[PDB]
Design a protein around this nucleic acid. Sequence first.
DNA 1: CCCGGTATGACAGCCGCG
DNA 2: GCGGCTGTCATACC
Length: 906
Amino acid sequence: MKEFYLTVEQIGDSIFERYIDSNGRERTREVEYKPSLFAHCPESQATKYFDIYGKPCTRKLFANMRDASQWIKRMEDIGLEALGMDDFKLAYLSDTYNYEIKYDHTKIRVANFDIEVTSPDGFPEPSQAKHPIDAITHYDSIDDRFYVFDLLNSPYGNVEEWSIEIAAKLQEQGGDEVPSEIIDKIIYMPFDNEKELLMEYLNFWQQKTPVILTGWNVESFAIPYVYNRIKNIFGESTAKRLSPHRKTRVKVIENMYGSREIITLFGISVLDYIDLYKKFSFTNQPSYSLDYISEFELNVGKLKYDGPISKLRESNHQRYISYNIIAVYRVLQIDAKRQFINLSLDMGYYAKIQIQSVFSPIKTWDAIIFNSLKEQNKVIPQGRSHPVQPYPGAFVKEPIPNRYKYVMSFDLTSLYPSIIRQVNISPETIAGTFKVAPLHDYINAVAERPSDVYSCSPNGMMYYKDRDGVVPTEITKVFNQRKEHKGYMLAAQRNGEIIKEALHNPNLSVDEPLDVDYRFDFSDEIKEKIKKLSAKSLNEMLFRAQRTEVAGMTAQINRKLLINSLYGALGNVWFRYYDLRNATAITTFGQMALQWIERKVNEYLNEVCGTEGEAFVLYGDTDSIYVSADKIIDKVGESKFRDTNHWVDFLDKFARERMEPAIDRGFREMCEYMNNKQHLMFMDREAIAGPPLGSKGIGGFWTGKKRYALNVWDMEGTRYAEPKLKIMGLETQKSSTPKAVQKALKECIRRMLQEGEESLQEYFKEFEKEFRQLNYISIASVSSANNIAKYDVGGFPGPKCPFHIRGILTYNRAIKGNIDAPQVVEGEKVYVLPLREGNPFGDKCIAWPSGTEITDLIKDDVLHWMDYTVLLEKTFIKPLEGFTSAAKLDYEKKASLFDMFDFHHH
DNA sequence: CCCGGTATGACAGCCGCG
DNA sequence: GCGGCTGTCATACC
């Protein structure tokens, strides 16, 4: 076993490191690390060190890290570049671990915990920590145990001890339904007072100090609450004891709304799962509370209880504790499915960074470029300050709002990373500039060729073709690595398939499985030794073949995330290799790419269909184009197809046989026109959309930029058994839209695309008739409660007050002086309903906390004074009118067709 | 620097307008 | 009384 690191930190003139040694023991080092930095020198001085520009550099070795840091300030005050890695933690990791890090997760202590705090005051602020911590569930990955800390006596109640017997029983039997998987894994311990509890938790923390600390909201609630609580009761010295190095910093996170404070525990990587999920799930969710996320991933959700949580410990302490245990297990179950922690570790050691820096695409890329440059004796440039200067971004085509019967879409692969390599874009690779014509003229190939010598972007930039760019080289690596690991994953998957044939007829023998590598396909000699092998050994080979497939999967997605990271880094002023001209070179070339191929697809389809001057490309967004296939179908005639699958086959082949070669030679023309280093503009066919054959459906429609619906039969080569609706930007996709209305609008769209006008009309009529019979929760809008106090003037709405906020202030006057009634909290989501003019409430609308019924001492009047008309018009009819206008359909039978004209009268 | 550019929509408030 | 704006706020997605 080769040693790896756990956490690294700099305190004064010392690196403090937690690390696993060659024997597997967790250990700590204090090293008085001697960093190196670099300055420019004359050609006379003989060094092996050069910068990315090739200019010679002399190596300066400092006695400590403070001298290094003071030297950087002195070089700034002189006006000369101070070259090298200024984040000395990264240099230490590079020096101490100059090899491919192979870690062993079972020796990494990964803790996830959750806290409970009874509070009749409202949400207990972590910075003040006014109320007693009355429960802690702390899971440890090494022990595989849930350590549960339980407070029996607090100012808010004296309670019985928790029962594991009851907690395991069925929910109908009065039990908490804690899974038998974790029942034999709970270490329960009750306490007579909070001080005893908090002090035991601290001693527990010292013996089992987390390397990775996770959980839901741990960074913004749990950790701050435990720290501040211990601090307020025992003093700051005791609270620092939560850090292995007894050093803590109070960070102030100032978001563009308010300001909150997080606590930095030196020697611990905090990877909050709420942040970890938002970063790596790539699924946009309405709510990000553990409850919603659990039921989404695990189909079980968080544990239910009766009454307000502020009254739970009193009324049902048995539930309260079991709710705390399950809260921790919910996160562990999610991580068992998604494995974002293992992912985070994988990338942390690949980049050689602090694990919590996986949230930073800047840190990660800074280190990956640093390490590969280090092994070539090359010196990284100094990070220079840059003014935040907004530059052009992605091109988006304004579509003509219409229906579109048949649609076929195509995507460029890894567009921005592809341009970087194609054009060879890097700081040191800038070769000069050319007099730039309008983009229009480069799209139409009317402008003169920018350079015979250098590779070019349509923004005026020129780059060397002979040199290998530092950025281009570094991302080509990542590409090649991903292919390599996805070449091992496909091999490990296919190698397991041959094993599954042997799982039907084996023969027992006392032998261990053969030493073979699953990353590469088996030879004939290994294939000969399959039937003879035993049943015990065959299941061991299947275990290790699948184990190899899991290792390949993790690697191939980690590199995928890096590919998509780079542009972000490159376009960020804080990044070392950032250059504004290089950034606009990427986006502008991309703008040219999509519009040039729009031209080429139009010119090809016109020539083939015989027509001239017809817009086939109906829409385009960044790296994708959408083609109208009507003419292609009408060229064969849709009456010649026997079924839906017949014309989907037709279009699929057409794209591959006719369209894709026309695109490739189209882009090959563009590469030669810009004189680029290599052609890397590749376009895959994604979606084939259209209405079912012999149906009155319209297939798809656009209402504007980023607002469309499509009936998709085939995506990226896989044929769907049943048609699947792709909806983007429309109200069905917005969490502000009421539950029943989100459902109704989707069906309205389904009926439009699959069935036609009359069906939509029959549905609308019925939904209008039955709207008043729907539940008041399902038909209410949801909104975010930001800036409540700002627009509040003595309990009434002020100038420029938003609609939902007005609703909140109406609710507040209705429950003014009522503690049992739910309070609307700044930040949290709210239900909104309109009220008929003349109601006993203040205004025209009421808003109450989301996910809850209204207080019974106000419910009747709300339900009585609801404005259904306004609600149906605002949330349902208006957005539908939106879709139907573009689609050129009617939702109501006799609508005057003169309504679609912007008449005079002016 | 632990994601903001390119987007649309709901609503408030203003301006002309016999 | 209502388009035609501008401004604030809310929420999509790569």
